[PDB]
């Protein structure tokens, strides 16, 4: 019979890099600016009713 590459069982070539679907990013990080905070619960003053 004729010799064919079928008989060699050659390994596949690995191609560099990874293909990925993109991830949706944070909206709150873009619509609200980050304020500098110290560790813990913050408290904010609100006006409940006017005179």
């Amino acid at each position: 019979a004729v010799l064919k590459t079928s008989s060699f069982q050659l390994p596949r070539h690995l191609v560099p890099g990874v293909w990925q679907k993109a991830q949706g990013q944070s909206v709150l990080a873009r619509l609200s600016n980050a304020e500098p905070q110290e560790f813990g619960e913050q408290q904010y003053m609100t006006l409940t009713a006017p005179p």
Binding site: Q23, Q25, V27, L28, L31, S32, F39
Partner: protein, 205 residues
């Protein structure tokens, strides 16, 4: 994997602040905490208002304004942002908003600053098949309008990406017993909402 850890910590701010869900399991956070979607300023899409995205945004703006607050920002589900960007004139058939392209990156709309993401739906996270908060009945949040100055937040502390070599850091079994490794990153956010009236939502349910 290192790159993917950071975007997961980023996305969590929206699932926490908008939806009040634990992103991993997708279930509601246990305290009933303040979340943007607590607002009674809902605009509900009916089958006739569905297919008119720009009229849903203006209706939601109108509810923030008649609560005496002025909105400055808009958040869109990326699917609804495409439906807005491709909205056709009802007789001439032309695109109404050709500057929006396919709606993947809408930087501003009407007078408002804008941002777009699947996180505005609650992402894949909220519909996690065994445990996600919306897996059975889904409030289909299409968009959020508001005075985004009334959502107050910051990074209180940060732990950068680092390698764990020892113990059982997740409950699966010890790393040295199993010849495994783990990488971890953490961030801690302060989050607060000054009024739920500062926000309105566009939804279908």
């Amino acid at each position: 994997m290192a790159d993917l850890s950071g975007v997961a910590l980023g996305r969590a701010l929206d699932l926490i602040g908008i939806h009040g869900i634990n992103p991993l399991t997708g279930a509601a956070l246990a305290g009933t905490p303040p979340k943007i979607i607590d607002t009674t300023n809902v605009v509900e899409l009916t089958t006739e208002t569905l297919g008119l995205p720009d009229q849903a945004i203006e209706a939601a703006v109108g509810l923030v304004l008649d609560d005496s607050i002025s909105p400055n920002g808009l958040a869109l589900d990326n699917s609804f942002a495409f439906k807005l960007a491709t909205q056709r004139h009802p007789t001439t058939g032309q695109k109404l908003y050709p500057e929006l392209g396919f709606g993947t990156d809408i930087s501003g709309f009407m007078s408002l600053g804008a941002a777009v993401s699947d996180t505005v739906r609650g992402g894949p996270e909220a519909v996690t098949p065994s445990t996600g908060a919306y897996r059975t009945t889904n409030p289909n949040i299409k968009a959020v309008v508001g005075d985004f100055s009334a959502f107050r937040w910051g990074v209180q502390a940060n732990i950068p990406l680092t390698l764990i070599e020892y113990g059982d850091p997740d409950g699966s079994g010890d790393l040295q017993r199993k010849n495994e490794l783990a990488i971890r990153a953490e961030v801690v956010y302060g989050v607060g909402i000054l009024s739920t009236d500062a926000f309105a939502v566009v939804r279908d349910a």
